[PDB]
């Protein structure tokens, strides 16, 4: 029973209390409905300005 140095936490053990804390997190997020889902991608003012708009439009 000596002691030494270790490198990393292992794969965390899936138990009852970890899953019920995760599934309470799911319950709270479904109630607020804040699912991080990929949103479906949508899509006369002044006579000098219209004259400036028309000059750049014909030049384009």
């Amino acid at each position: 029973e000596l002691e030494f140095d270790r490198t990393a936490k292992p794969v965390p053990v899936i138990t009852s209390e970890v899953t019920e804390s995760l599934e309470d997190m799911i319950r709270r997020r479904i109630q607020d409905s804040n699912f991080d889902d990929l949103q479906r991608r949508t899509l006369a003012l002044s006579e000098e300005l219209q004259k400036a708009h028309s000059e750049i439009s014909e030049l384009y």
Binding site: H53, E55, I56, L59, Y60
Partner: protein, 182 residues
């Protein structure tokens, strides 16, 4: 012409038969020799368009900055020039007045684009191979070396089939499949 002495050089400070102020520092023949274009008016034909891009550059800037008509417009022109290949940057818009250049528009010609794809030894030997009828853009070969190749169209410039310019290339690799008479 006689490497004129000091007492007449001060009298003749402003004379030069070789360099005049309208000749704009001889930037015509400087970019002509670097990129090897044939005739004489082709540099200035690009300069009218490269001046017209700069004319639409300044005329876009008297407009207010948060103008929705402006907000659509130069990004449409930037994508046009990016697909042209003359400017190779989408971030800045001040590049559409500064980086828009005849040397930017003449490196998208055909014989320079050979040299960027390393298909020719020099920038001049590309003009020799284009004029002899070796180079095609898709199905058809083009003989005029003053062809601007589109940024999309840059991918497809190969040698023409059944040609002696291709046979030497494949013979070094020991790859000649002469069923396709290449």
């Amino acid at each position: 012409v006689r490497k004129l002495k000091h007492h007449e050089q001060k009298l003749l400070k402003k004379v030069d038969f070789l360099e005049w102020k309208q000749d704009q520092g001889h930037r015509d023949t400087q970019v002509m020799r670097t990129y090897h274009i044939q005739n004489r008016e082709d540099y200035h034909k690009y300069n009218r368009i490269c001046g017209d891009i700069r004319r639409l550059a300044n005329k876009l800037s008297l407009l207010p900055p948060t103008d929705p008509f402006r907000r659509k417009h130069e990004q449409l022109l930037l994508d046009k020039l990016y697909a042209m290949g003359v400017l190779t940057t989408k971030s800045k818009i001040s590049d559409l007045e500064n980086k828009v250049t005849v040397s930017a528009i003449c490196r998208r010609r055909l014989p320079v684009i050979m040299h960027r794809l390393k298909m020719a030894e020099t920038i001049q030997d590309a003009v020799k191979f284009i004029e002899q009828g070796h180079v095609r853009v898709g199905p058809n070969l083009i003989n005029d070396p003053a062809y601007l190749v589109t940024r999309n169209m840059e991918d497809y410039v190969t040698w023409v089939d059944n040609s002696k310019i291709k046979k030497t290339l494949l013979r070094y690799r020991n790859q000649i499949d002469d069923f396709d008479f290449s």
